[PDB]
Amino acid sequence: GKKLLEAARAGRDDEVRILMANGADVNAADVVGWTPLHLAAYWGHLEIVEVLLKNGADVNAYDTLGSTPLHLAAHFGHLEIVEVLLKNGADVNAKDDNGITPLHLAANRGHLEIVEVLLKYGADVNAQDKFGKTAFDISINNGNEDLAEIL
Amino acid sequence: LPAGATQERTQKVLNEVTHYYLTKEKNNVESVFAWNGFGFAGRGQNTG
Amino acid sequence: STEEFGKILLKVNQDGSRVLLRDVAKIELGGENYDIIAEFNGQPASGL
Amino acid sequence: NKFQLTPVDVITAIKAQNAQVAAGQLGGTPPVKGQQLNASIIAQTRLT
16 A cells, blocks of 8 residues: 555656556555655656556545645646646546646646646636636736736 | 046946057966956945 | 746735736846956956 | 823934934946946934
8 A cells, every 4th residue: 555655656667567466556545645646746757647547546536635636747847747647537627625726737837838738628717716816817927928828 | 536436437447458458468468357346445436 | 036026916906906026126136236347358257 | 291202202213313324326336327426325324
């Protein structure tokens, strides 16, 4: 149970394969509700993401503050992992406990490509967080003229 | 330079000093390290 | 970064609009002070 | 008491009106191109 999580955090492939091959819960969650997919998306281990999804890892698992692997990957600029998660059924409009969506996070960092991918997959451009702010608002406040356009 | 003289005016004098050494003394001088704003009488925009 | 300093929120106007630091200031990495211009053969220089 | 004052007000006024202020310079650095004047600005100085 726990060997999978730190294996996925470390980015140790064959280990992970041996652990589902030996029966490790792909949906095992640490104390803050992070799953191996959360950890792999966070640190950016694209191949691990594919292997856990190939093995039935909940693509929409959420941690104790409502955040999903897609949030992590959008936030930190892991474009290919965003694509993979989205092709495997990642909820493009999932909201964490703050109302924040992957589009908000990707917008906040300026990851133009992720924003376009999320939009192509149906990201609600008008979704508001708990403060009433949309990805457009974020782009204005940041001064990002390139992003402010696409939105 | 005189009282009240500005940094830009000192810089033109220093640029002429630099130019002299690197042309009229091209054979003897390897470099001129010019500091605009402090001198041995004190500091200030009119010193270099 | 300069971008983060620029979005410091100074004021929220009556009509709900926002006054940011970049609306009243230019923001750049610069020196702590500008009293000394240093040149080496007429090019910008630092040193030790 | 006659003027509705306390020693707090006296202390505040002394700190504000017996003060030595740093006020920068006319033509201070970094300056505008073509500046011709550089002078210290002298604002409040300690009482004597």
